[PDB]
Structure 1
Amino acid sequence: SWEIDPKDLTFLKELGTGQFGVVKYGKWRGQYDVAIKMIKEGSMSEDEFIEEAKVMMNLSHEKLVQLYGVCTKQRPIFIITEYMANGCLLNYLREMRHRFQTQQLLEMCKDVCEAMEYLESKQFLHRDLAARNCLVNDQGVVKVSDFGLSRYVLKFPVRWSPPEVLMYSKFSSKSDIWAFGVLMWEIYSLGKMPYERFTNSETAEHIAQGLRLYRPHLASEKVYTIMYSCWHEKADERPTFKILLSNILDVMDEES
């Protein structure tokens, strides 16, 4: 049930390259748009991934990029996902022509938070949440992509990592929370790199001294309060995604 017959795939356009190599746009059975991730040999722990794919296919949420299945009886293996016509969220933010309103930026935050509250409720960590791992569909809806997939990569995301990850490799729901707050900073900064003048090493040292990302000027005070709450030093003092969704809904109502 997790397995797609590659004979049902028609490869139509190269979309570009991601973590595991090329991604292509194609059709399934001549009819349905799909994205086809072609997994470069040697890059992925494929047996482990295949087993986890069965779990990932039972995860269904409107704001999660859907895994349609995998093609595993060949090399390279393929991962078949929902096609997202407007590409990577990071590139989308950086296109100044969109002239985003802040209500649109908050909606992107809500989209991601909804997906992450769903993953939280399933006790599933993303482990690499960031604007580069979100995608945008033809209706401007942002969805969370490649959740959990860093576990199978045979370059660490220092700038999306809380102190207990940098110091001790303590991953938890609350390291996804921290990364979400950095993602909100990416959205309201229109895609700047977090800690844009620092190296990864400098970022980690400054985080150790309590530096935090500055308020992007497009974020209101209440929006900054939300992303800042994700960066409490003690992981247990950071909200859940359920609390964050409620805070985002509140600010959406106040700024409507």
Structure 2
Amino acid sequence: YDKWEMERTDITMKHKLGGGQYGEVYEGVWKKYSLTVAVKTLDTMEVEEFLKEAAVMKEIKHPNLVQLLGVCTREPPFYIITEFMTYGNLLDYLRECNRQEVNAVVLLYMATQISSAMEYLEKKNFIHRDLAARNCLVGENHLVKVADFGLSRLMTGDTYTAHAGAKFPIKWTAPESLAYNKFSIKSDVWAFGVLLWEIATYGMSPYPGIDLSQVYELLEKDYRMERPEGCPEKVYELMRACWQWNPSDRPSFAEIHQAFETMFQES
């Protein structure tokens, strides 16, 4: 709390990041260290929600989770200051990358990193609820960090019920969430599967061409996305395992990370 607090004049604001895709996030400079930082500023979302986002993040410490640096929560406008990522989101990164550099073993390394962060959150009784390539960020040397700004506290055996009339990213959303607004860590496992598919396709859109209003119906009848071009069968089986209808049948992130660790060590 107090140790995280810093004065607003320690930061110089530059231009907005991502053209508003991340919301009110600006590139900033922490003058004292001459360090480029990311500053979330607050219309927009509610104040207490904003403040809780900051409160949760200072409990979070993992090499593959975006790190909180400080906060300005004494006088408006409120600031949340996090580390700045060199390249931006994983989706645009994969679409624009050199695939000879970002090859099969790099993809595996990226999945291992993301699954490592989710294994951590799983242990710390958190859920993400928006795991996707657009919410992963990339630093140099194929470093990947999961954005952890919308984390919810949830015990491992419990269920989060989203508010009435909530809008979901349908093509990343688990069937129990689409139908009953229920979220759990197994729901993040589903989203991870789709995130894997994004990575294996270098940023293709999920269920391409398929009408959003029929996605749930397709899932009911056990339709699943095809094995991507050049995707290892073992990796695709992990994807299919993530997309099991019964959430309790889906793998934990501990098992997912272990499987990816093995593959990354054997290539």
TM-score by length of 2: 0.87
Partner of 1:221: 233
Partner SS, residue 180 of structure 1: helix
Partner of 1:128: 130
1:76–1:204 distance in 2 versus 1, CA, 3 Å: farther
Aligned residues: CA RMSD: 2.2
In 1, Cα distance between equivalents of 2:255 and 2:241:
11
Q: Residue by residue, what CA displacement relative to the aligned partner does 1:31-90 show, whole Å, maximum 9, x if unpaired?
A: 222111233xx2212213313422321210001011223223444432211111011111
In 2, Cα distance between equivalents of 1:121 and 1:132:
24
Query: Of the candidates 19, 23, 26, which is equivalent to residue 23 of structure 1?
Result: 26
Partner SS, residue 29 of structure 1: helix
2:173–2:190 Cα contact (<8 Å) kept: yes
In 2, Cα distance between equivalents of 1:28 and 1:173:
39
Partner of 2:156: none
Partner of 1:164: 176
TM-score by length of 1: 0.90
Deviation at 1:3, TM superposition (A): 2.6
Partner of 2:85: 84
Partner of 1:34: 37
Question: Equivalent pairs: percent with the same residue?
Answer: 44
Task: Kindly indicate whether residue 179 of structure 2 is the aligned counterpart of residue 176 of structure 1.
Answer: no
Partner of 2:113: 111
Deviation at 1:128, TM superposition (A): 0.5
1:108–1:141 Cα contact (<8 Å) kept: yes
Equivalent position amino acid for 2:141 in 1 = Q
Deviation at 1:202, TM superposition (A): 2.4
Partner of 1:102: 104
1:210–1:114 distance in 2 versus 1, CA, 3 Å: same
1:64–1:115 Cα contact (<8 Å) kept: yes
1:31–1:96 distance in 2 versus 1, CA, 3 Å: closer
Q: Residue by residue, what CA displacement relative to the aligned partner does 1:106-165 show, whole Å, maximum 9, x if unpaired?
A: 11101100111011110010111100110001232000013425999x952111111111
Query: Which runs of 5 or more residues in structure 1 are unaligned?
Result: none
Q: Residue by residue, what CA displacement relative to the aligned partner does 1:186-238 show, whole Å, maximum 9, x if unpaired?
A: 00110011112123212222122221111111310001111111111100000
Partner of 1:47: 48
2:53–2:151 Cα contact (<8 Å) kept: no
1:14–1:24 Cα contact (<8 Å) kept: yes
Query: Which runs of 5 or more residues in structure 2 are unaligned?
Result: 153-161
Segment of structure 1 superposing worse, 22-31 or 244-253: 22-31
Deviation at 1:20, TM superposition (A): 2.4
Partner of 1:210: 222
In 1, Cα distance between equivalents of 2:34 and 2:74:
23
1:27–1:245 distance in 2 versus 1, CA, 3 Å: same
Partner SS, residue 92 of structure 2: helix
2:53–2:150 Cα contact (<8 Å) kept: no
Aligned residue-pair number: 252
In 1, Cα distance between equivalents of 2:150 and 2:16:
24
1:118–1:28 distance in 2 versus 1, CA, 3 Å: farther
